[PDB]
Write a protein that binds this ligand. Sequence first.
Ligand SMILES: CC(C)(COP(=O)(O)OP(=O)(O)OC[C@H]1O[C@@H](n2cnc3c(N)ncnc32)[C@H](O)[C@@H]1OP(=O)(O)O)[C@@H](O)C(=O)NCCC(=O)NCCSC=O
Ligand SMILES: CC(C)(COP(=O)(O)OP(=O)(O)OC[C@H]1O[C@@H](n2cnc3c(N)ncnc32)[C@H](O)[C@@H]1OP(=O)(O)O)[C@@H](O)C(=O)NCCC(=O)NCCSC=O
Ligand SMILES: Cc1ncc(C[n+]2c(CO)sc(CCOP(=O)(O)OP(=O)(O)O)c2C)c(N)n1
Ligand SMILES: Nc1ncnc2c1ncn2[C@@H]1O[C@H](COP(=O)(O)OP(=O)(O)O)[C@@H](O)[C@H]1O
Ligand SMILES: Nc1ncnc2c1ncn2[C@@H]1O[C@H](COP(=O)(O)OP(=O)(O)O)[C@@H](O)[C@H]1O
Ligand SMILES: Nc1ncnc2c1ncn2[C@@H]1O[C@H](COP(=O)(O)OP(=O)(O)O)[C@@H](O)[C@H]1O
Ligand SMILES: [Mg+2]
Ligand SMILES: [Mg+2]
Ligand SMILES: [Mg+2]
Lengths: 554, 554, 554
Amino acid sequence: SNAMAKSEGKVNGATLMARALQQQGVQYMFGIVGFPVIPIAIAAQREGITYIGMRNEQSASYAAQAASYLTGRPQACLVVSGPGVVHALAGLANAQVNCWPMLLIGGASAIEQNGMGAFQEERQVLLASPLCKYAHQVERPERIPYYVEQAVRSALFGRPGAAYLDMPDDVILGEVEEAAVRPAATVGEPPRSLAPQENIEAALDALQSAKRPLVIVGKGMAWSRAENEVRQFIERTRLPFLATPMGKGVMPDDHPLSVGGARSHALQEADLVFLLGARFNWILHFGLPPRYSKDVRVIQLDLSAEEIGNNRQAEVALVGDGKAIVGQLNQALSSRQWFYPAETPWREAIAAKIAGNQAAVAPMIADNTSPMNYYRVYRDIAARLPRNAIIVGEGANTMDIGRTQMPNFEPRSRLDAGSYGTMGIGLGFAVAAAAVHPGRPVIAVQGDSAFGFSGMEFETAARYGMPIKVIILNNGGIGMGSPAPQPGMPHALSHDARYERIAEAFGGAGFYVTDSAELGPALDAAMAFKGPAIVNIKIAATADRKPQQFNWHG
Amino acid sequence: SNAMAKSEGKVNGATLMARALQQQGVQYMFGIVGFPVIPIAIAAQREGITYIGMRNEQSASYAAQAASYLTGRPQACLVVSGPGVVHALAGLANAQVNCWPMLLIGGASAIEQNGMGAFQEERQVLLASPLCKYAHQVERPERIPYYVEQAVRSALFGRPGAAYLDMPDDVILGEVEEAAVRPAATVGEPPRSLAPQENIEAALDALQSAKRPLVIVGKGMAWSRAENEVRQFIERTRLPFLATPMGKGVMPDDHPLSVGGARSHALQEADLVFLLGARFNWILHFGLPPRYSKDVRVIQLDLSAEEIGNNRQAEVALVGDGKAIVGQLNQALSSRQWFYPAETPWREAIAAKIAGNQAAVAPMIADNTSPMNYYRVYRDIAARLPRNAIIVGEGANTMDIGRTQMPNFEPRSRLDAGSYGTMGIGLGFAVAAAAVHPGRPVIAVQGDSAFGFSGMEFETAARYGMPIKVIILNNGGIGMGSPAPQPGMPHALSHDARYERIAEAFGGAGFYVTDSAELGPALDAAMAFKGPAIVNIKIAATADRKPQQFNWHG
Amino acid sequence: SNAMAKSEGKVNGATLMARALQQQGVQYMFGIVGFPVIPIAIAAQREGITYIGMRNEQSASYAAQAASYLTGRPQACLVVSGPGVVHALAGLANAQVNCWPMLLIGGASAIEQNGMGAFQEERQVLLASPLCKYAHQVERPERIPYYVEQAVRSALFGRPGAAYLDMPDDVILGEVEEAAVRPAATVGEPPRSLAPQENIEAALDALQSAKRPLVIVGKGMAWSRAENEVRQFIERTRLPFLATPMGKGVMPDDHPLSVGGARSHALQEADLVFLLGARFNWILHFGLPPRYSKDVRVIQLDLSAEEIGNNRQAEVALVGDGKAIVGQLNQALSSRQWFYPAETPWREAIAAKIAGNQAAVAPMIADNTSPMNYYRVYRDIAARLPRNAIIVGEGANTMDIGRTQMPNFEPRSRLDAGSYGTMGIGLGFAVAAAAVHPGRPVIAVQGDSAFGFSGMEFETAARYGMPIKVIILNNGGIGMGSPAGQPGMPHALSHDARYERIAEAFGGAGFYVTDSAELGPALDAAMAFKGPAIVNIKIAATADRKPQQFNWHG
Ligand SMILES: CC(C)(COP(=O)(O)OP(=O)(O)OC[C@H]1O[C@@H](n2cnc3c(N)ncnc32)[C@H](O)[C@@H]1OP(=O)(O)O)[C@@H](O)C(=O)NCCC(=O)NCCSC=O
Ligand SMILES: CC(C)(COP(=O)(O)OP(=O)(O)OC[C@H]1O[C@@H](n2cnc3c(N)ncnc32)[C@H](O)[C@@H]1OP(=O)(O)O)[C@@H](O)C(=O)NCCC(=O)NCCSC=O
Ligand SMILES: Cc1ncc(C[n+]2c(CO)sc(CCOP(=O)(O)OP(=O)(O)O)c2C)c(N)n1
Ligand SMILES: Nc1ncnc2c1ncn2[C@@H]1O[C@H](COP(=O)(O)OP(=O)(O)O)[C@@H](O)[C@H]1O
Ligand SMILES: Nc1ncnc2c1ncn2[C@@H]1O[C@H](COP(=O)(O)OP(=O)(O)O)[C@@H](O)[C@H]1O
Ligand SMILES: Nc1ncnc2c1ncn2[C@@H]1O[C@H](COP(=O)(O)OP(=O)(O)O)[C@@H](O)[C@H]1O
Ligand SMILES: [Mg+2]
Ligand SMILES: [Mg+2]
Ligand SMILES: [Mg+2]
């Protein structure tokens, strides 16, 4: 009753944590409650944070980083002591490798029982630390504002990455006087740095000297929110560009300067590559033979000074923020006459290779034979994707062929297995996208193996009214199908699995497709259904991607 | 064709690894293939090792240690580089905490690409090391026999724990001359050590002197295979005994001397406790007030010398193997004639407390009201459990009430959340049990939250023809249900979920139960169905365990 | 004054720690004070603990483990925050590698400043944990008895190793009510375990079947205080034995059964090796060719089950305590007549190899040429070692030649570079020996390179009145000397250095020897000087050890 005297001078750690998270712009918290973190989730809701309770911490820790990428600010994963934290190490590793921020909040057993073999006693900061930019235990409740500020700043500033805060039971429930708690500042936007002017002019001088220049647009530019500057730069210079898998959409994928359909030739024959927030790691084949000229010249824009010149020396280094530096280049271009000319041999070679690759996939796209091939399946899928959708892609062939057949027109609208090649991100990423962008459609296209890692999160989607559209391409195995057996092959799964009945366990709509004639009607119904859906497509066991000169891994 | 000359002088790392695993007694390998470990799973199958391809490495790593516990030998988990290893860290942590052996075999990116940002390059030994007794990279294929011997020996000897072997791609595919490979010795049985004679006699002296003695039978005795010796020891001494959660069955749970129905009174009032392969950690409330007399005398049998006297000093230490040391006690008891007398006040107090607790839960067991309470549901489950079943239990109220309502009569026939309190072990444990003991029934009783962590492994079971019986107690939440919402509560799940439809996705039988009259017939049909099955029981949202003087955690 | 009322109800962390250490048998504490550990050292002295302030924590951490080995109980090293702990990691690593206990107590910056960049803030537990059996922070002063008990037990019990306790400034100075502090039990002697009777009898059966048996006596027997049992065993069986470098003295080095002077032959030709608390690591050349028969049979006695069969399979495993198991063997031998016969080809071969090696070094021992060779120097040094001395040996040729030329007659009386091959242990070990055994002479024979690592601790010895006798064999470099516009060679030091003047800096006696006629008188004067002393011997730059078939490392 409001009539009785109530003591209001004290606040506990759970409440201080919720307030600090909200002050620092955490709007989404993905996790699974239990000892000792129930009060944190409840307190978070009372501050208006959106708590999404999931079915495995592995998926929760993936959702938190996806939500961080999409919002531009660290979002939270909340897990119990012991195995809750160990399950969530999955997401720390993935966020580290992708340079994505996130905040993992792990409960811990009470400090006063350390050494005793307490329930879920664990060396949690020690376990998390090699996967984190920042990891620290909160030893007393009155320092929660200090630590939340420092952790969010460390995750968000510089090269982004994962931050971990350890929350012992006795700190969560510990109480301090309201007026005694020292405030913290609100973490603002990440600082942006610029390049020296001499480097800006040297970059432009290099571009003008090149006979076969190539701009590579990576997901660092998407994280930097540099899409306006990049679009202006490519329109001004008229340089050919190649998008990386999650750099897709920074330039619209239908831009006439994209070399995406001539990727192998463009990398092989360029005499100059301009990396925009993209690494010469495995996704770009290291900047080295056999995928590049041994003498390829490199302009490299990265926020990370230590990344400059990895594997292949950079002729011009542009260390700083992608948006700010491309802004400098656009400003410097306004005093120059040069642009990449409308007709060059390079342009003609690129066009010819695009035409050849188009010719290679044209009969597969047109083939209505059932069981379907991947290109036929994507002909129907691509036709149902609205231009403002968020696309989650996961699998081997399903994901890789999906990457070329599903264009993105706006940045940060594609989430996939990323720089770690992770299976297991799929429905976590979709749940994150639907929480952050409830006004936009969310379509996850998964292989049958991929779907098994996180498919139980469909119940999560249904519970929060998230109308995610899950499309499974089922070839009955990992990368390829398998004849019925003699033991089953290690890569074999269940070609006749009726995964769509999982939707029906949770109030969603399930659709099963074996024949090309069923596929359109199934997708139209799934898109129209007011709720989450699974379309389970039984595809050809031996369907494969377009032949190429080089294996993707090599 | 066998007609053409084939060079047979060379063998590769994958084949050496399969042969060494087979030599060392590894019979089960749970994993998910992909780069770079496909050759290892194929080679393992060629040597006759059973390969179980699962749906998430988290479950595979849990399956591996359950198989090790059941077989008495380290069994393998096989995972890909990068996130395959990070996902499997779950199983390493669980194995460390339960003193269970396992062998995790993690693929790695090729050594010659280290530093370059290779696909799934990761510091895998470093990440695994805090969770392992033994962790090492295999740097050259010709060292494979050496390392597999050493890792298996390290995991199995002494206090058991997890071993990790890192297998780089170029080691897996690297070839050596068969004749050149150094063989390794076959790892035998774990050494057993004995206590000094004076300690054996001091232990019997102390038991003779006690007014209220209590033997506590822990899962170390199950691991030691000490059940014959423990059974002879209790029959000879006639001492009251208490089983720990997975120590159930070492003594038959229906034994007249069990104090399991008077657990709180027995721990509170004992003047002497004899720990048999059981720790004074949280499961036994640390051996300290408020759950024990502050002056409780302790005899402590543990293989780990460092464990002796943790939290509560041991009056008599018995450091060595459970089977061997209880064997010494039985021998020394054939030269004394003491037994604990047939009539004592302690016996009378224990019996009256058991009778009071039976009366306390009898009305709930008998109550046929629907939605049902937990004790009612277990009345039908327990009446249908075969005496040789392997029971997997998982959840909070589901698991803990199932612990009291589901007796075990043989050792090593209960697998549950264990010393780490882990949600997520459920279907991986069930799959391991069906793999190891295909001629025994395997029944997993899970809460609805618990089922969500690993439920996709139902496809794994169906694919290998494992007729696991999954019984879900669904209260719509973690620990308790929740009314309709304002946001849904953090612990709420879906009370109306039709989880049994997941069975129908993979060719199993699904049964849905909301009324007590339905429960009997559904369980009968599920047990009789020649295949895996899910029985989804919608139980009362506020059903709870019997009241107790102390919280289980405190 | 005593007349004033004084509150006495409160005690601080520093005092609680000093009392707990004294309760647990810590008698010696080696360290360097500073923030925040000054109150710990003062409190320690108030409880009667001997505090030895050293000149570098590297040496202090080596002293602590040597004192632990000599006393049989963990002794303490006390260091400041940050670099104090980092400097002491040296000792942690050495203690792990040697299976020696020690307790490192590292001060830490105050918990309330964590995250702020406090003076010497550091992740101290994390840095120490890979080098420790046990490492924990003390988070509250009332837990100090609990943690000190647990750390001492973890260090001392089982296979011994290093323990680390982290002591934050606010825990050291924090106060609690005396009456409120929970006592901890006193850690007693390490538990001893026995082998099964079948293994005892199989060991004696194996020994009787061997044609060329060899018993190897390692420093695990010295740690176990098994010298009486081992001497009885060798006297009873008449088996040839070999001492390891710090196993010397467990058997007296002048025992007629020692194969010390025929080591390479004994290892090469033995058909059966009985390891007594010694590992097949590098010191015993792995139990493998080219140093052993490829079919050598092995009986292995180790406390560590996981060590059994490393590198070479064990035919008979004896897992348990060295004293207890050799006790079992001696007892089983009283029911047998068997002993190794007085005349066998094996004895004849051993004796001829011994005579051959004595003849090889006899002229070097007798050669009075100056500058002297190593064997000539040790002729005079060995003549002047009292039977009860503690010998510290450190260097390459100085240490290795000293090992064969300086016999020990009592166990635990030789301290040397050990299983890690460490330069830097010299004067810390000497200071530890002089603190623990002030009634025994302490003689450190060091190479000129070795001396430079720890030579400043001579001021520590002088300050505490420790009459350590430091003898430096100076060849002007690392392993060998060198001639004097080219740079100095990397191994070269100062052949004409006058190291003995360092004794004179600190009130000790310095002697300089270049001529063989000077050596006897200098050693006699140094031994008689009632204080610490340095005898600096300028030896031949090219003096070397006796030629051998095999390099010591290989
Ligand atoms: C490493 C990669 C960036 C390498 O890129 P590629 O696959 O070689 O190129 P993609 O951009 O996908 O294009 C594929 C080929 O199709 C051509 N292409 C692309 N778009 C088109 C269109 N629109 N029309 C016609 N042809 C096209 C393109 O030129 C390539 O051919 P060519 O020019 O002839 O080469 C990528 O494969 C990748 O990100 N893979 C993810 C791997 C992963 O994480 N797997 C999960 C674990 S698997 C291990 O267990
Ligand atoms: C690894 C070792 C145990 C290997 O032993 P060895 O040196 O081969 O044997 P030792 O016992 O020292 O004996 C040496 C040789 O002398 C013979 N020998 C032994 N005693 C005598 C006597 N009294 N008289 C004559 N000859 C003797 C013995 O049979 C050996 O010859 P043969 O029978 O003919 O072989 C040891 O070398 C060692 O511990 N080295 C430490 C290395 C180290 O840490 N250095 C400091 C770091 S170096 C920093 O890069
Ligand atoms: C890896 C991991 N993540 C989370 C937890 C917390 N875990 C609980 C232990 O505070 S147990 C509950 C299941 C209860 O929910 P349930 O299965 O529906 O059973 P029931 O009680 O409702 O009958 C939760 C989720 C955990 N231990 N380990
Ligand atoms: N604001 C920023 N400006 C420029 N570069 C950035 C910024 N934030 C992160 N980066 C960099 O972007 C790069 C992303 O590379 P990568 O993840 O390999 O992209 P992709 O997979 O698209 O090639 C990282 O090297 C990271 O340091
Ligand atoms: N062969 C063995 N003999 C005796 N004790 C063992 C053996 N193997 C393991 N142990 C010990 O068994 C104990 C198991 O304790 P715990 O997991 O706490 O049991 P519970 O959960 O049943 O109480 C561990 O302390 C472990 O060191
Ligand atoms: N009480 C004990 N009884 C038997 N062995 C022990 C005991 N304490 C330690 N040990 C063992 O003694 C061994 C010493 O081996 P090592 O240091 O290689 O000796 P050395 O250098 O003399 O050959 C270690 O393997 C250790 O586990
Ligand atoms: Mg597939
Ligand atoms: Mg529930
Ligand atoms: Mg020298």
